[PDB]
Every structure is written in structure tokens, then in C-alpha cells.
């Protein structure tokens with residue numbers, strides 16, 4: 001009577017902790033999608049918050065039934081788990097301080113770049129010549145690093161950077177063509193061979209899109 005979802009709730013507006021009024025709720029676009037799935041199945045949704053890097057291992061081990069975490073369905077990951085249809089696009093960007101000497105992609109050479117372990121953002125940064133990778137479990141620490149001068153830049157998705165920059169007013173996004181040369185988009189992951197759940201997930205994503213509910217969710221999370 002339960003479906004267990006794994007996520008990494010450091011990724012507003014997809015999943016994050018909204019802490020106010022005596023509540024600590026994990027909320028976001030991905031959570032709304034998860035609740036639509038739970039409702040179709042007629043079960044209770046339980047969410048486990050963990051480091052992003054642990055999500056695929058948890059799914060493989062059966063510690064969660066599905067992962068929704070702004071997760072890109074890469075060819076590499078498809079060897080290990082199964083992915084739903086895409087439910088949102090995404091783009092890699094670079095975040096720097098307002099007074100950064102970095103203006104363009106070439107300027108990233110030899111720099112210290114904060115990235116989240118196990119991500120396409122990390123994959124993108126690894127291609128920078130002579131990069132000094134600073135690898136973090138959680139995105140929130142990457143922003144603390146940049147604020148405190150412990151890195152020169154962050155690589156992270158555009159929509160998430162925009163969310164963090166609501167608070168981090170001394171940072172800016174650089175839209176560099178070349179940093180986005182990785183697989184894009186987000187999809188739901190389920191364990192390899194779990195067709196029953198995958199089919200339901202794909203049906204729910206399709207019905208969200210076709211019923212108008214998806215557009216309501218997108219307005220709520222991405223059009224503010």
C-alpha cells in the first residue's frame with residue numbers, strides 16, 4: 001500500500017525542503033508528479049531524501065521503487081535502470097560571482113569547478129582542460145563554496161541556478177554553449193525490468209500532459 005520514491009531534495013524547484021509554519025515538507029515539480037503517480041496506483045507516497053549519487057544504487061537494491069530527481073536518462077544509466085519518457089527539458093549553465101574574471105568557456109581552463117557527484121553536470125565539467133574538480137554530495141554545498149570563494153564556478157542546471165540565485169544575489173548565470181554538450185532532460189527512473197511500474201509512470205506523465213494538469217504544474221513551479 002506504499003510506493004517509495006528516492007530523491008535528492010537540494011534541487012529547487014524540482015525537489016527541496018520547504019521549512020515553515022512548523023512543517024518540513026519535501027516539495028516541488030517532481031513531488032507533484034510523484035503524488036500523481038501514487039494517486040493513480042492508489043497508494044501512500046513515501047519519500048527518502050538522499051545524496052543524488054546514491055539514487056541509482058538505492059533503486060538497484062530495491063530500497064526505493066522509483067527515483068524522481070531531475071534525473072537525465074543517459075545512455076550510461078540506461079544500462080542499469082529503466083527510464084520513463086522525458087517530462088521536462090534541461091540545460092547546463094555556469095554560475096559565478098558577479099565580479100568573476102570568468103566570461104566565457106575558455107576561461108574555465110585550470111579553474112576550480114564545483115559539481116555534484118554522479119551528475120551530468122560533473123560529466124560536463126570533467127571535459128574542461130586542466131579542470132580542478134570540487135566534488136560535492138549536495139548542490140547546496142556547491143553554492144556555499146562559490147559564495148565563500150572555495151571554487152571559481154559551479155556547473156548546474158539553469159532552472160536550479162535561478163532558484164538559488166533568488167537568495168544568492170551576488171551570483172550570476174553564464175550561458176555557455178559548450179558546457180551544455182551533455183545529454184539533457186529529466187525522466188523517472190525505475191528498477192531494470194520493472195515494466196508494471198514503468199508503464200504506469202508513462203501513462204501518468206502522458207495523462208498529466210494531455211489533461212491540462214501538467215501545464216498547471218509547470219506554471220506553478222517554472223513560470224514565477
Ligand SMILES: NC(=[NH2+])NCCC[C@H](N)C(=O)O
Nearest residue numbers: 008011069070071072119120
Ligand atoms: N536532485 C538533484 N540533485 N538532481 C541532480 C540532477 C543533475 C542532472 N540532471 C543529472 O541527471 O545528473
